[PDB]
Write a protein that binds this ligand. Structure first.
Ligand code: SF4
Ligand code: SF4
Lengths: 420, 415, 421, 414
């Protein structure tokens, strides 16, 4: 038992929803207690979604337990199908359903519907939200993707964009356009926007852009062996990272590297005399593996901060993060305890924090400038405006985002100084 | 054209889009300054508490969960040893807490964890400083506000004995509302009155054969059972929403105490004029408009009564998670006799009924809200009604304001 | 004498620099003392510019007054021509040189340079920055534009974009997109980005888009008379205004409205249930005439706020503002005095204030939420990222910017109450 | 190798990129709690204070400008009567003010308003609560820091008379620095010691034939003149930047006070040792780098002395708005002999000399800074040096830090 208040990640079945709601023409059926539908809030409220998530619960409760629970699952499945006629479905277990004997796969096949029902295995007590998204998506792909003829034109997939993803919407927009300036067209982008019938057409791409390891890696690895498709190892967040990413793509495809930089303004903003007080400002960086690794490079090598603490909440990125941290002379903090973070921050005594919504609150408690660099999504860090983290515009967005709280801090500090 | 007493109520159960009893903790704890609520359950449950709490989560609230680890599933009590060092660790944080609730969840109930007995033991091991209770808050046996009920009911058996003739108002009312309530009931001459829950553990009410109690909230069946079990006797009243509701509520108490009509009308005149005038500000936009309420809180029936009789709203289908025959009878007698009543929910069925009625204003939770707006229906988010000051005279305007607003916005946004 | 601390606009000549710095291949020569070069720090620092502004001063000082001042202006004109061989030049007087007796016109005529030198009359003691810019661009256009054969394709001009403009960069960008969406291609864009030569080829556009009246109205009128080009009377800020701007262009061109709205999210953002608490919230709007008028429509008719005070510092824009404010049942506030503003804000008790860098400060002192909608501003509201205000992305930028200080407001207040009051 | 006393100074004037004296108000007023600075000038003048003051403008500072109107241009009887009305108003709006400074601008002086007469006239009226002075800050006769000089020089004739033999340290310094100076001097046995200006109007120093003064800031020629005219004798010293400068500064004072060499080394030793450890931290990046300075304050020569001698920088061209030959003597005697000096500025010319030199670090104003970066030259904005604490021992490291930072950054981003 672990005494718990704040949680950076939800249960794995929420990650499942995250993949299902991302997609289209796919119903997900969770075997779970009445109540677990609270997770719809997340999608309809935070992401502003205009439709119910394609998720439904068997809804057992106290008066219909025992041998009824398996029956209620069969109905849940049956109904979802009759009502929505999706291209495919997925079935999984909530943590409460996990303590029962009901075989989703048994129940599932005995009903046999005219579409595939992919059973997912999400260990609710050892793993979390991110893995669940990853596993679900790998499971969907393993069940639907077949090897295919390559497309005439040089094309690629986009792997790992999901529902409650930090800036997935605009990241996908920005990455598409920077790939298209090299004449690389996108085949399917998944899960986000993809249907099960799109998962079947994955094979025909030349390679894959692995946008988010936390939600895409398993599926990327399957696609590598099953379709002889390489996948990009570099996540294009930061100017340095984007060039390296394009470089990587160039070597994967043999295409020359082309950029549009006419609107890239970060390098000059950071070079400009106006930035010199940024030099050596002590930054603490927390969030998920991917964004932390990316943030730290921009901080050190692009903005001229001194990276003074570095870590993440998701175990799955512990090693790439450890490798990254060493290059800065730091030992990676790996924890999901925000009280552990509150301590590592007090110790590191930074002048600015780049974290999640929680770090924002710790930052306020300590009276220090802060910017949000990764999920968990709150409604605010879900903009109506164009707000990518990736590629060249992304780099512009990040500069404004991070520097602003710094200037507001210096400015508040100065105002009160000359008031007497 | 008023009275749904003999109206056939639809009993319905299938897919459900409602909260578990755990969510009660989010607003309940604010009221009980002295207490802490420890959910024994899942990361799912913590995830829920976090989602419902929103911004409160960063204000070191007096709740949290002990989340089950894989090693706790392995068929091995203790179990009771884990929970115990987990409790001692909490109470040391934390010496100020005086009441501790072990709140049962689906996972804690499916693993047959004996939290009742845990409360028993830990009270033994932490007397007299801290006292520890057990109640259920699971999706399995409880819906949203039903969690307040199961909480107070667990308290009732252990309240002090007394032979005093006193009034208890039951239901966690917001601090300002409670004050106005005490004031009004003082002014009528109603001798000692106590809230349950009380603001602090050490001023809880006593109960006995001569206690009277009146419900301030509809969702209090079990607390009512528990109070009745100790000899205390209920005063039936419609719930104090709006000017009519509040008067009918105060009146049932006046009558129980033999307060003169001369005195009732005197104490009650100005606060009533006040309230009635506040409500008319919204009548333009509200009148003649058709209403639909999805089940969330058990507050829907009385509020439907407030919107029909005092706001000239046309009623449609009004659903509630639970419909308690005796408690709700005063309010049912006042509901327009056209109203289709539902207890429970088959979500897909209920949505087909909804699209067919095409109602002007729909009360629902955030699972449904935006999806419905997208379909062209104005919606009012139900959950606000459980924590906003809404009861009694002074908040009657504000209350109607809550429903007029989404309809006013809808208008304003089409030039 | 008027006792002054904060000033909403600078002196007219600074407006001249806005035009000259907006352009390329134009030198502007200013007759003024040493030290007035401080303005250079506005374009270099705030606008983050990467070359010395194309502006030079005669630089007279106390030991070089008298007959020396008219020689020094001569030398500045000579020097700036020799060294930069610009296409055309401009000459004007600062506030101190306006007190002196030298003729900027006669001297330049008598130097007899091989390019045009436009003389600019700038009443430094009664007009401000905005007028200077409006007048300069007008003078130049008057000087350089001729009637011309219409373009084979339907093209237009973008008039008004200058240097220290609020979001000029990205507004130019965004308007070009939606015009291109309708099959209209921009001829020249002036001042921002043009050369004196570009200016010569203004006449051949079918029409002019008046992007910012305060710095373009004068020239658009000229080009109406002289080249029979109508100009647009609606600034596309906000969804509703953008739609009316598109309708306006259609009437002028005959081409049908075509929009790419695949990315326009404000309407649903504002419609969505997360926005309900926004209804009725009292808003106080100040800044440009143009930006205050545009803002008020978004506030009232798009976001659902009650508009509770409208004003601007900008006397040239006072009639269209008084007209606009009447519609909301409001007296327009025409003043350039921050203290007047601070009082009016105090009187109307706003829940959110939309204005200038000053109004931000008034707001902070009052502990009220706030967002910047208008010039002038310091470095921050000159962003590295795409941040238009015009058109559809403009509409999303605008929703984000106005609503976020409000949610942070509700948030701060909620958690001070939560822990625990 | 190290003497410069004799090298020929280039004297130029043409196009300039420098601040006028009005700017001095921004950071002077902060020190002079009792005082309000009223500029009489254009909207241009108001605009410059607004720009130079940055966010200080929203902090109700104790300056402002009486911006001229069309009716004011002129003639003089009515221009003077209006100023009086505005001053009267400003004073009843803040009765906590005891000194008002009418600050002359370019527009005011071309218009020929005798702000001297106006100050004289207004002191008569507003006595005994308010003394009103007049000085020029105009672009016509002042560059940047010279406004402090004209201001302080205006105050001198009116300072109290005294026959005491007291020290006056001249030139506004940050309150933190002031205190350190005072402490070092007090524990060196030197007293009593007064600052000019003083934190408050009622605690200003008095002067007489027996007074001694020492400049803390290079730009104080007129004030020197004004104090000498009153009977005070100066103490020559290099300027207290760096461990060397601060020591020599202090040495000059202890000497003219009969302090033993013994007592000196004892008070000064710990702060000195600490000082040059803080400088070490910067030696790595600064040693061997070439330095170029456009003219802005008059700190350029002293600072180049500090950067060459203690930081190992190689000086190329050092420019200054004005070179006071006697005041700047000690510091010139310490500048590297290779140094090419310039008083004044011809901007286009100096920019060509610059390109030709290709120096590692260029000190310059914000109008020059960004365009110079864009051409691959590391720059340092000059103005910060007039408002950041940079004098004496405790600040020597920060001072060096002001010059390493920009080089560390150019490095750090490639
Ligand atoms: S429905 Fe059950 S498992 Fe889910 S959050 Fe509620 S108590 Fe926990
Ligand atoms: S005094 Fe002269 S240089 Fe200074 S702001 Fe006024 S006009 Fe410009």
């Amino acid at each position: 038992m672990k005494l718990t208040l704040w949680t950076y990640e939800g249960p794995p079945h929420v990650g499942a929803m995250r993949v299902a709601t991302a997609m289209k023409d796919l119903q997900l059926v969770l075997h779970g207690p009445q109540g677990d539908t609270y997770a719809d809030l997340l999608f309809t409220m935070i992401e502003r979604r205009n439709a119910r998530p394609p998720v439904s619960f068997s809804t057992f409760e106290a008066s219909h337990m025992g041998t009824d629970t398996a029956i209620l699952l069969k109905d849940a499945l049956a109904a979802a199908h009759a009502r929505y006629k999706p291209q495919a479905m997925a079935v999984a277990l909530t943590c409460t359903a996990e303590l029962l004997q009901d075989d989703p796969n048994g129940i599932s096949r005995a009903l046999n519907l005219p579409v595939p029902v992919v059973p997912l295995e999400l260990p609710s007590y050892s793993r979390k939200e991110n893995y669940g998204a990853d596993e679900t998506f790998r499971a969907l792909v393993r069940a639907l993707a077949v090897p295919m003829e390559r497309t005439p034109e040089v094309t690629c997939n986009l792997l790992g964009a999901t529902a409650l993803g930090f800036r997935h919407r605009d990241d996908v927009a920005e990455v598409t356009k920077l790939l298209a300036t090299m004449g690389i067209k996108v085949n399917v982008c998944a899960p986000l926007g993809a249907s099960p019938d799109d998962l079947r057409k994955l094979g025909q791409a030349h390679f894959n852009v692995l946008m988010y390891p936390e939600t895409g890696e398993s599926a990327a690895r399957h696609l590598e062996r099953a379709c002889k498709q390489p996948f990009t190892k570099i996540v294009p967040i930061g100017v340095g990272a984007t060039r390296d990413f394009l470089a990587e793509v160039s070597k994967i495809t043999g295409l020359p590297v082309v950029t549009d930089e006419s609107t890239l303004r970060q390098p000059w903003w950071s070079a400009s005399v106006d930035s010199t007080y940024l030099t050596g400002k002590r930054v603490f960086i927390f969030g998920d593996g991917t964004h932390v690794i990316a943030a730290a490079r921009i901080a050190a090598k692009e903005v001229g901060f001194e990276v003074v603490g570095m870590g993440c909440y998701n175990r799955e990125m512990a090693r790439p993060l450890r490798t990254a941290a060493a290059e800065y002379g730091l030992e990676a903090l790996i924890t999901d305890d925000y009280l552990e973070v509150e301590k590592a921050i007090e110790a590191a005594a930074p002048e600015l924090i780049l974290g999640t919504q929680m770090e924002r609150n710790i930052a306020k408690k300590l009276g220090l400038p802060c910017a949000v660099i990764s999920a968990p999504v709150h409604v605010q860090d879900f903009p109506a405006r164009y707000a990518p983290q990736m590629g060249f515009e992304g780099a512009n967005v990040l500069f404004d985002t991070w520097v602003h709280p710094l200037v507001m801090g210096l400015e508040e500090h100065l105002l009160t100084m000359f008031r007497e | 054209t008023f009275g749904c007493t003999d109206s056939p109520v639809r009993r319905e159960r299938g897919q459900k889009a409602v909260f578990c009893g755990l969510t009660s903790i989010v607003w309940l704890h604010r009221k009980m300054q002295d207490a802490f609520f420890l959910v024994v359950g899942s990361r799912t449950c913590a995830h829920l508490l976090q989602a419902a709490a929103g911004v409160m989560i960063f204000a070191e609230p007096r709740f949290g969960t002990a989340v089950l680890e894989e090693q706790d599933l392995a068929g091995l009590a203790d179990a009771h040893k884990e929970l115990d060092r987990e409790v001692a660790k909490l109470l040391e944080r934390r010496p100020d807490i005086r009441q501790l609730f072990l709140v049962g969840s689906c996972p804690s109930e499916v693993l047959k964890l004996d939290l009742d007995r845990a409360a028993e033991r830990l009270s033994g091991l932490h007397a007299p400083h801290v006292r520890v209770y057990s109640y259920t808050g699971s999706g399995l046996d409880t819906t949203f506000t039903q969690g307040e009920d199961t909480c107070l009911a667990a308290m009732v058996p252990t309240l002090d004995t007394t032979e005093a003739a006193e009034l208890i108002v039951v239901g966690a009312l917001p601090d300002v509302v409670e004050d106005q309530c005490l004031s009004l009931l003082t002014q009528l001459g109603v001798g000692p009155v106590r809230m349950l829950p009380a603001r602090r553990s050490d001023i809880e009410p006593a109960v006995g054969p001569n206690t009277r109690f009146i419900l301030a909230q509809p969702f209090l069946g079990e607390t009512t059972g528990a109070l009745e079990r100790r000899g205390a006797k209920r005063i039936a009243a419609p719930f104090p929403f709006g000017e009519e509701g509040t008067t009918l509520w105060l009146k049932a108490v006046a009558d129980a105490y033999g307060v003169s009509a001369e005195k009732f009308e005197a104490v009650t005149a100005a606060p009533r004029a006040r309230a009635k005038k506040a409500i008319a500000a919204h009548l333009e936009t509200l009148t003649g408009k058709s209403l639909f309420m999805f089940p969330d809180s058990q507050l829907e029936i009385p509020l439907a009564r407030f919107l029909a009789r005092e706001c000239g709203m046309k009623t449609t289908e009004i659903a509630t998670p639970f419909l308690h025959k005796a408690i709700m009878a005063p309010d049912l007698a006042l509901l327009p006799s056209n109203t289709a009543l539902t207890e429970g929910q088959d979500l897909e069925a209920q949505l087909d009924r909804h699209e067919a009625i095409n109602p002007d204003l729909t009360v629902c939770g955030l699972g449904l809200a935006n999806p419905l707006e997208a379909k062209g229906h104005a919606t009012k988010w139900a959950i606000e009604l459980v924590f906003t000051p809404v009861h009694f005279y002074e908040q009657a305007g504000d209350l109607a304001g809550l429903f007029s607003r989404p309809l006013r916005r809808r208008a304003l946004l089409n030039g």
